[PDB]
RNA sequence: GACCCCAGAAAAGGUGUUGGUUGAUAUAGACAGCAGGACGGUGGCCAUGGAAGUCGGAAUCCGCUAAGGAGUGUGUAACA
């Protein structure tokens, strides 16, 4: 079945501007800008509001797997307005059981260096995606703070260091050593 | 320090549950570090402390001398605090203004040792000469030409024997 | 020391039954055709549950065995020792035979090695009679029974009453009127004719 | 069942507004069956209470409008979890002997702690086998007199925050009155009035 | 706490047990009994449901009391050795009776049914003392 | 010696998930089929066994 | 994937998608999520070294209720 029309609107506040060429998006905040194009789908992308800014996301003669893209490019763009006006914060909690994994961070945040990880002499290098700082935290102490515009920027930095400090030829449920992923927040907590 | 006190709590839980005996024969068995009965240290580098011997350098920095030694040796382990600004113990985590405090173990028996490590194992010569000059130790042949964990061991070997 | 069944899953020879020309034949593997509960009235169990080919092919009693104890089992352990009543409708009655390996295909007619059922496109397999709140299990037992037969089954919850050829609406009202007298599992047919005497014996 | 429950539902809550002319409104917090049995039993000789589907209600009471007028003050009131109480004493008297009859329910773990409870420096009594919770709690004890003895008085849960797995079990173990709460009087209504 | 606090159950019942009982094992709790406190005390509480008997003890530092929590399976398994409507409705006077009641008739039910260890018809149409015992 | 809540926050990546009976493949806690095609995204999942 | 003979495939699976059959719930508020309660007789009886709702054999009830199985599963030696 094809479905006549399926859409969605995202409502846009005051503070953040949205600008449309074609398929591609772009997102002005306080906290800088996001660009994002979504050629890759076929869809109408319209601005219908001067006064409180709706952005719609319109899909005609769509099939079920092309219908499932419309939320997914609503909540996209959701993620870039929240990344715009809050940012996004990703706490690291490294955990270990006897040897203390030592997280120095290098130049301005973008890289990280793991030392001791279950005790190995070998040093893990993990390079943030640009956009993306990492600092350890003052409030906890195995805490590493990953924080940035791009949630997709973000999240893959985490799982970078989350996948570089991993066990091998052991029983994981066993030595759970490694650097996790403990929250998933917004910076500004507004 | 809280490890100790764990390790120290674990003791005396076993000596209360299967010693049944209380204060009799044997009177009190529990260990305390207040006491005396608790040491500290590492045997493969040969040294060791009590607080007994921090009270009583402490003391000579400050028969009657055993009796203020022994006041110190409770005065320096448990949750009793001393503030580093003013010199003087308290009892209160919060200090007159609100900052936190370090305790008593932590501040003068652990802080002097952690600083010893931190500078022979940084390899801060100045540091280094400053902690043994000012701990008063002397060094005796073929070991002030030995640097980091050998200079480390050596000086605790001499230190607190 | 079995052929797979594969090797005798078609009804390509006719049909070769145990008789004075075909002597020496082993005994077939399922012995027991009816389970449960088979002495229960014809009131007790009105919901009949039928497993039904699909395939004009041949089913070994091995088979059929293997799907009497499958479904039995489940049965048990769902419905109870005595909650279900099991008929088999399939008898072993066709000889399979086997050519061991003079020398050669010389003198190749073979000794009986088995028995099959033959069984047809739309034939009953297996029924299970039960109360009303047992289809379900029912129909997860002849299901489960299915996985021992090589062709496609069906699992059909039949119209008629019960074990009976009378429909399950029209039952009742029946033997209400006497058209229907039960005896044992089944029901005995009275029909308007005959003489006054054994119609008679009933109304009284 | 569930039209006749429904239907019998009804009948019960028509009936029993009619029966009773006077009733409070009372919001139920984190309340067990226990401590509602126990309002029960303190309330059942003179009162009576009743709360269900707060659309079970309203749907009663719409239809009931017209019948008995005055009822439509409870419709845009009757939100969130709460239930009637039909009496007929007075106000005073049933406010202030519902929030007597108050009950100190445990501190579950993973529930909000609004109430700050501390544990003193005392002698629990405990045998010294218990000491497992203490030091995951990472609290200082002493054995004397063969028991577990608090050294100083440590600050176990604060305001607005989770209870720990740990915390709850050393406070069901050390058995005092954490945080408690009952049924809340929302507002009150006497023959077609609201006040607090 | 008055001057005790050893509200602990004990559930020993019928023969004396004494060394075979888990008195030992739980006696060192209180520490008052021993082998002649539970030697009385199982003496005083020999009878009286003489079942499992999960009871509770009050020590008076050197006597044990035994009180019998009136569990309805200890009593009916305790007076049988038929309708017995009369000695079930005596049965439940000295009870704490709370049986998160209504009526005594609420009471009387609860352990019509809990006696179905069939007393369930009568549970449908009682209609004989149902406020007989208040 | 990893406090619980750490215990916890490890084992939300490390033990808490279900395995394929077919291609072994490990899956979220959550999971009815399994996402790889080389079992046929089958519905037969099991638990990841614990070191209990 | 792609044309009689014909030149390669089965049982069994799929929360891929597309049609269809039958049934059920729901404005007296469905479904899913997040959030509260999940009781009392009663640690029901017999099994017993301990089996307390959860190794088992039968029973499968009652009251308060908005509702709760004398129990769906994890877990404990048994509890929790
Ligand atoms: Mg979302
Ligand atoms: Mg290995
Ligand atoms: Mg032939
Ligand atoms: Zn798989």
Redesign the interface.
């Known amino acids: 079945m094809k479905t006549i029309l399926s859409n969605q609107t995202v409502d846009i506040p005051e503070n953040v501007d949205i600008t449309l060429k074609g398929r591609t998006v772009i997102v002005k905040g306080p906290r800088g800008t996001l660009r994002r194009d979504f050629n890759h789908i076929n869809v109408e992308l319209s601005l219908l509001g001067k006064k409180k800014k709706r952005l719609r996301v319109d899909k005609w003669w769509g099939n079920r797997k092309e219908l499932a893209t419309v939320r997914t490019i609503c909540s996209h763009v959701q993620n870039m307005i929240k990344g715009v006006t809050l940012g996004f914060r990703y706490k690291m909690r490294s955990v270990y059981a006897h040897f203390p994994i030592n997280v120095v961070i290098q130049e301005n945040g973008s890289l990280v260096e793991i030392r001791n990880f279950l005790g190995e002499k070998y040093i893990r290098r993990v390079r943030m995606r640009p956009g993306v700082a990492c600092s350890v935290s003052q409030a906890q102490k195995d805490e590493l703070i990953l924080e940035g515009n791009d949630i997709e920027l973000v999240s893959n930095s985490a799982a970078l260091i989350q996948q570089a400090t991993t066990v091998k030829n052991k029983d994981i449920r066993k030595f759970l050593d490694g650097i996790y992923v403990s929250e998933k927040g917004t910076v500004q907590q507004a | 320090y809280?490890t100790f006190?764990?390790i120290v709590?674990?003791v005396?839980?076993i000596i209360?549950?299967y010693g049944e005996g209380?204060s009799g024969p044997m009177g009190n068995i529990?260990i305390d570090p207040v006491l005396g009965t608790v040491g500290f240290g590492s045997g493969l580098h040969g040294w060791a402390f009590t607080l007994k011997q921090f009270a009583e350098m402490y003391v000579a920095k400050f028969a009657e001398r055993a009796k203020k030694v022994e006041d110190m040796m409770k005065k320096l382990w448990?949750?009793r605090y001393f503030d580093p600004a003013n010199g003087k113990f308290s009892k209160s985590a919060t200090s007159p203004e609100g900052k936190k405090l370090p305790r008593t173990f932590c501040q003068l028996i652990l802080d002097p040792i952690f600083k010893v490590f931190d500078a022979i194992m940084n390899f801060k010569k100045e540091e280094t000469a400053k902690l043994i000059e000012k701990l008063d130790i002397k060094l005796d042949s073929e070991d002030k030409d030995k640097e980091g964990k050998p200079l480390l061991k050596a000086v605790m070997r001499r230190w607190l024997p | 020391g079995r052929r797979p069944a594969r090797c005798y899953r078609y009804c390509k020879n006719k049909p070769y039954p145990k008789s004075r020309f075909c002597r020496g034949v082993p005994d077939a593997k399922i012995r027991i055709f009816d389970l449960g509960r088979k002495k229960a009235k014809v009131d007790e169990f009105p919901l009949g549950g039928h497993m039904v080919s699909d395939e004009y092919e041949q089913l070994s009693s091995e088979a059929l065995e293997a799907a009497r104890i499958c479904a039995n089992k489940y049965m048990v352990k769902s419905c109870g020792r005595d909650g279900f009543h099991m008929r088999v409708r399939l008898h072993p009655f066709h000889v399979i035979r086997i050519n061991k390996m003079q020398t050669g295909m010389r003198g190749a007619f073979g000794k009986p090695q088995g028995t099959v059922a033959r069984v047809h496109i739309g034939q009953v397999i297996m029924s299970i009679r039960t109360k009303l709140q047992n289809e379900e299990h029912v129909i997860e037992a002849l299901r489960r029974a299915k996985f021992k037969f090589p062709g496609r089954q069906k699992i059909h919850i039949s119209k008629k009453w019960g074990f009976t050829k009378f429909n399950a609406d029209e039952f009742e009202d029946m033997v209400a009127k006497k058209c229907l007298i039960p005896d044992g599992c089944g029901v005995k047919y009275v029909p308007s004719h005959g003489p006054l005497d054994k119609w008679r014996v009933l109304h009284s | 069942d569930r039209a006749t429950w429904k239907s019998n539902y009804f009948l019960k809550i028509i009936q029993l507004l009619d029966d009773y002319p006077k009733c409070f409104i009372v919001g139920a917090d984190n309340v067990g069956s226990k401590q509602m049995?126990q309002i029960?039993?303190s309330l059942?000789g003179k009162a009576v209470v009743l709360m269900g589907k707060n659309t079970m209600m309203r749907k009663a009471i719409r239809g009931h409008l017209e019948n008995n007028p005055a009822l439509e003050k409870l419709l845009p009131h009757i939100r969130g979890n709460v239930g009637f109480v039909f009496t007929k004493e007075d106000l005073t008297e049933i406010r202030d002997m519902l929030l007597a009859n108050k009950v100190p329910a445990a501190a579950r773990a993973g529930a909000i702690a609004p109430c700050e409870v501390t544990v003193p420096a005392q002698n629990t009594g405990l045998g010294?086998?218990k000491?497992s919770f203490f030091?995951?709690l990472?609290i200082?004890?002493?054995?004397s007199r063969?028991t577990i003895e608090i050294?100083?008085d440590v600050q176990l849960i604060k305001t607005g925050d989770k209870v720990?797995?740990?915390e709850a079990t050393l406070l069901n173990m050390l058995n005092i009155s954490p945080f408690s709460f009952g049924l809340v009087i929302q507002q009150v209504f006497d023959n077609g009035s609201i006040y607090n | 706490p008055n001057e005790i606090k050893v509200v602990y159950l004990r559930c020993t019942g019928g023969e004396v047990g004494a060394t075979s009982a888990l008195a030992p094992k739980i006696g060192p709790l209180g520490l008052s009994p021993k082998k002649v406190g539970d030697d009385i005390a199982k003496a005083t509480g020999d009878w009286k449901g003489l079942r499992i008997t999960v009871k509770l003890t009050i020590q008076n530092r050197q006597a044990q009391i035994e009180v019998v929590p009136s569990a309805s399976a200890l009593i009916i398994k305790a007076l049988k050795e038929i309708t017995f409507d009369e000695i079930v409705n005596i049965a439940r006077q000295m009870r704490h009776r709370?049986l998160?009641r209504?009526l005594s008739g609420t009471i009387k039910e609860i352990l019509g049914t809990a006696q179905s260890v069939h007393p369930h018809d009568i549970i449908d149409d009682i209609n004989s003392g149902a406020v007989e015992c208040p | 010696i990893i406090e619980?809540?750490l215990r916890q926050l490890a084992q939300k990546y490390n033990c808490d998930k279900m395995i394929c009976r077919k291609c072994y493949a490990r899956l979220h806690p959550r999971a009815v089929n399994c996402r790889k095609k080389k079992c046929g995204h089958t519905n037969n999942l099991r638990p990841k066994k614990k070191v209990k």
């Open positions: 809280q006190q764990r709590e674990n005396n839980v209360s549950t209380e529990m448990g949750d | 049995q029960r039993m059942r010294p086998e000491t030091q995951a990472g200082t004890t002493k054995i063969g050294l100083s720990g797995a740990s | 709370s998160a209504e | 619980p809540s």
